[PDB]
Design a protein around this ligand. Sequence first.
Ligand SMILES: *Cc1c(COP(=O)(O)O)cnc(C)c1O
Ligand SMILES: *Cc1c(COP(=O)(O)O)cnc(C)c1O
Lengths: 363, 363
Amino acid sequence: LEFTVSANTNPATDAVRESILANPGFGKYYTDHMVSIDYTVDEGWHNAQVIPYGPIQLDPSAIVLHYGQEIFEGLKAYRWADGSIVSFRPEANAARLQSSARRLAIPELPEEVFIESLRQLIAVDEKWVPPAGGEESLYLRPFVIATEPGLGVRPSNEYRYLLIASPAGAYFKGGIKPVSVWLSHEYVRASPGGTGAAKFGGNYAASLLAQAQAAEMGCDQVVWLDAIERRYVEEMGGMNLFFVFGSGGSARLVTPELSGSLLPGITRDSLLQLATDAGFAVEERKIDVDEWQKKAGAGEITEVFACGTAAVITPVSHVKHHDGEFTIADGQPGEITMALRDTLTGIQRGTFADTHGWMARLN
Amino acid sequence: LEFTVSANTNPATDAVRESILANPGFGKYYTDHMVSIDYTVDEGWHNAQVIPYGPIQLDPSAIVLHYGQEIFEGLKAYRWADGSIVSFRPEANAARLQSSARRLAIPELPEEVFIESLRQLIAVDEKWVPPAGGEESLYLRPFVIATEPGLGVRPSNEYRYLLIASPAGAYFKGGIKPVSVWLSHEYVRASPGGTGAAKFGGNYAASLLAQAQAAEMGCDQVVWLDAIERRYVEEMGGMNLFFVFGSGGSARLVTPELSGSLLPGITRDSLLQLATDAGFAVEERKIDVDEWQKKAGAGEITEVFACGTAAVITPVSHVKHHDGEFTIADGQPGEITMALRDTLTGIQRGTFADTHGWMARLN
Ligand SMILES: *Cc1c(COP(=O)(O)O)cnc(C)c1O
Ligand SMILES: *Cc1c(COP(=O)(O)O)cnc(C)c1O
C-alpha cells in the first residue's frame, strides 16, 4: 500500500513541542500529523496517507455514532541512545487489532499495513519522540471506526483507520505509587459470550459507573470479579493483575488465566516470560477473593500489581470489597514488582538485552 | 433553552424529496435539517440550534471514537388526517434517554429540552413527514455522543446532542411476514448489572456476530437467552418478545419480566396495557426454551411475536436452537398478534381512541 504525505503547514513550534515533551501527562497532547486509511467493500483498504492532525468529518448517521462499531490499540515508540526509534512488540498489537476486529465484525487491517502506518507517522513526527534514557515515550493510538451512514443495525461497509500519537509521561497520577482497589460487587467488565477479549470502546463506556463507585468507596481503582460466580479476580480497570507468593528468587507468580472474557494483555504475556527468565515459577489459574484476603493476611501473598502498556506496572497495596478490607504487605511497592518493572522498561529503553527480539525498529 | 435556526440553503429539490417519500426504506435518507445542542461543564446544555443536515466534525481523540460513550433513542412522528403532526409516547423516550445517560455516565438532557428538539425539527422539516392514512412515518433518532478530546479513560466533560430524522415507509410492503429465529447458544446480549437496560451503541456492536451466526444457521433473527443459566428467553435482536397462550378472548399473554438486564421497551409496555384493555390476562415472568418448545408443540402456545418502535410487531413462526427446532402453530401470523398490532398502530395513526393519552402533538 502506497502512502501519500500532506505536510502540516502550521505544526507546533519547537518551543511548544519541547514544553509538551517536558510535561506531557497522558493522552493530552497530539503530534503534528496522523495516518488515515479508508476502507470500502470494493476497494478494500485504500487511500492510505499521512495528513496534518485535525478534525475528522462524519455523517450524522455514521454507524460508529449510533451502534458503537469501533476498536482500538495502544502501544509505544521509544527513542534509543543510538538515535533510533523503536516500538515494543508492535507485531502483537497488529495481531490483536485483527482479533478485536473479528469479534466486532470489522474488516482486518493487514499487519504489514499496520506496521507501515507506524513507520510513516514516525517518519514525519519523529521529533515528538522523547529523549532516550527516560520514562517518557510516545503513545501510539491506532483505531478503526465504522463510517457508513444509515440507521439500520448491521456491520458497516465503510471504515476509516486512524493513527494518532500522544507524548506520554505517567498514566497513573504518581507512577512510583501503589493504588488501592475496590472489588466491584455490583458490576462486571464482561461475561462469557461477550466482548471482554476485544479492545473495544463499548467495554470502557460500560465500566464508567463501576470506577466512579470505586472512588466513592474511597479507592483509586476498580477490580473486576468474574460475571458467573462473582468470585474470581480478573483485572484492575483495563489492566491485568499478578500476585506474588513468597519473595526472593524462589518467589512464584500467579495471574488469572485467559478464561475467554479476559483481555490477553501483551504486557501480561511479556511479564510471564520475564518472570520465567528470572527463575520465578509462574502459574495462570483462577484465584478468588477468599484466597486473596486469606493469604495476604497470612503473608504468603507478598505483593500484587497491575500491568498494561500505559503504566507498565502499577503496585496494588490496599483492597476493599463488599465483605472486607486488607492491606498487602507493608502497603509499599514490592521487591519483585519493581524488579520486573525495571527489567521490562530496561528492555524497552535499550538498556537491557532484548533476548526475545521484542523491540522492532520504526525510524 | 432557546433554539436558533440556520436554514438549509441547499435543501433537497421537491423532485428528490418526493421520490424519497415514495420509496424511503428505513434509515436510508435524512431530512434537510437536524438539531444540535452542546454540553460543557461550565455552561451545561447550551447553543441549541437547528442547522442544515450535514457532516459534523470531531477531534481524532474524541472520547466517543475510542471508548464508545454514546447513547440513543428511537421514536416516530406521524401526520394525522386533521393535519397535525404527532408522536407516540415521546415523554417516555425522553425519560429513557435519561436512564441510558445515567448508566453511561452521560449528563441527562431535560425532558423539556428533548420534546422541544422534536418540535423544532418538525417545524422546519414538516414536509418530510409522510402523508396521513397510511403506515409510513418519520423516524426520529435522538442521540448523545462524547466529544471531548483526550485518550485518558473517564467520563467525557463535553457532549453533543443531535436529532436527525429519516423517512420510513411501510415496514411490511407486501403484507406482514413472520420471521424465523435462532436462539444464540454462543453469545449473550448482556449480563446482570451490565448495560442491557440502556439504549447504548456498545450493546449493538457486540451483537453483530451473533446475528451473522443466526443467519448462517438459516434463520432471520437471533434470539437472546439469559447469560446466567442460558435457558431463559429474553429478546429477539433489539426487540422484546411475547408469547400467546390459547386463543380467543380467553387468551393469555406472557412476556419476560424486567429482570434488570432486559431493555424496557416502550412498545412492550404499551402492549401489556392494550392486552389488559382487551381483557387478556397478562404475565411478566421467566420462560425457558424447554417450556417454549414443549407447550408450542402441545398447542398451548399459539403465537409468538416481537415488538419495537421500527416494526411495531413482527410475528415469529419458526424456532431453531442448539437442542431442537419447531414451528409455532401453522407458521403464520397469529390472530392475537395481528389484533394487537392493528390496535396499537390504529391508536398511533389516530384511527382508534387514545384512552391513555399516549399521542402527543409536535407540529
Ligand atoms: C488494553 C487492555 C489491557 C492491557 O493490554 P496491554 O497489551 O498490556 O497494553 C488489559 N486489559 C484490558 C481489559 C484492556 O483493554
Ligand atoms: C430499543 C430497544 C427495544 C425496543 O424498545 P421500543 O421502545 O419498543 O422501541 C427492545 N430491546 C432493545 C435491546 C432495544 O435497544
